[PDB]
Nucleic acid binder design. Sequence first.
DNA 1: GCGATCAGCG
DNA 2: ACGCTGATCGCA
Length: 579
Amino acid sequence: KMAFTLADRVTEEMLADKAALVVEVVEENYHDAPIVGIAVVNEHGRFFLRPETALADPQFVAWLGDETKKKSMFDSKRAAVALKWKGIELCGVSFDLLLAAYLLDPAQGVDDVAAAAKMKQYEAVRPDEAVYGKGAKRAVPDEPVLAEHLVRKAAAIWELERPFLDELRRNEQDRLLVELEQPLSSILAEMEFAGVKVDTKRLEQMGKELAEQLGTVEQRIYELAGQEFNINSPKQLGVILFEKLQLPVLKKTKTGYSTSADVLEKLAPYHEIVENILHYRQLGKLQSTYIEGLLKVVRPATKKVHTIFNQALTQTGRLSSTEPNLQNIPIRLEEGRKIRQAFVPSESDWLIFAADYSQIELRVLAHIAEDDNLMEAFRRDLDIHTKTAMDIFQVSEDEVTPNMRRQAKAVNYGIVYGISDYGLAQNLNISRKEAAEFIERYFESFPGVKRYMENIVQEAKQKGYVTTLLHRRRYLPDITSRNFNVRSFAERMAMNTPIQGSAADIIKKAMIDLNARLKEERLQAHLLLQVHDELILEAPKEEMERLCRLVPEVMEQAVTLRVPLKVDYHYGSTWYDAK
DNA sequence: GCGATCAGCG
DNA sequence: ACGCTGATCGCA
Ligand SMILES: [Ca+2]
């Protein structure tokens, strides 16, 4: 039902200077994944190519790599990384429909062309699920069915760039798409393809040591509980704790007894099995997720893991990291922080460099709320987390333990993002009246932040959405809900999303300026990871000096706020030593 | 498949 | 009854 050429060879009319392009990687994880078909829609017609044909043709490769030949795509990063695994560069992507859809409404969860087309009442294209099937029935269909479905996706991309750019313009998001998200998409492709090298010997050794520490812990648990049970099964774990040992019930999930770590820490005075269980889970978490899980996804030839950065998933504009998640590698506990010793540079004589913004969401909040005292605090380069530990625990700066600090870190974010006195009290083991009066005092020092939280909720109510400093947008329909719980979660979304998503935009612009900087300095240094407010690079040791002077300035200068941005930086032989 | 849990980022 | 994630595991 759609006219197109099944091309046997590459012709000149498939090489126009503007085109919609589809490079299908059906595999979920597109690293080293097969390319199953290629479709080109342009002013001369609709063409389907087999990858063996086109990806071996010198003119087609030349056309993919030519930045002056513009391509419109859905999920250009997926295509670009699959082609990198094939020795082929893709440039000139001028429109990425996936990222256009994402800016317009991140809650749609657009994950194929058909879902984004629907936003503009375009339906001449099928959902990928309907073509490839789900689960274990997943299959590339036959060439005639595959070819039409790629051509329909391409035709759809072709027809929708203009209506999508039009809405982006009205929303003030067009420069956000073309100058921020699409450039960032090429950078993330380089980072994902480059990978991070992993010391598998060291990781293997930790795994053998974790196995023997686990049993030993697991044994004391069995002799304290009397019997044995699936310590991971809250069924009999509940029966052990809140029935056999008769410990108080402090929380009930919808399932039953809550055995979460906040509860267990509160039961620590009652019995010496709750601490062992906690130590057991920690050791379990390290062994399943970061020892075993990491070794599974290591590419054996190179000992590099290749994350996938989701750019169009989170509701606030942050990235997300998947298979493996390299954005929640342990750091706070010593046993788990040792895992970062396994993450090493990909080349002898190279080092890891890591820079990060100091309390960036609070600096943003100070800029957006225009709160005098909060702006002054950061113009003094105060550490508000330590200064809050001092007020909480009534000590001096020298006496602030890192524990008291991370606790005040949660009070600072918790208070500004709507924590209740109940919630503040559960986290400080103080009375609920003390927690309420601390929150009153805290908004005495920062009335401008209080005004800001009231106003942003009135602005959500009026407009239907909240925006970020760079005009990322998030619809909050529940902000006017009649249900008190549903309305309150939406109010705290209105207080949080403009801040957290403004910090995501800032580090996104920083990454873009960093790459351009590294290119004019022509350094071999390159990004490896982004962990929300931290940029981790690797580089030859000969380049660290330059990087110490370039990376902080580039980050601090990404945007200009009414308070300065602060950046800490370290380097070392491993990611461990880079903090 | 989903809820609980927990690792990280703020 | 602060917010944003992803992986693992058990299953009331
Ligand atoms: Ca930080």
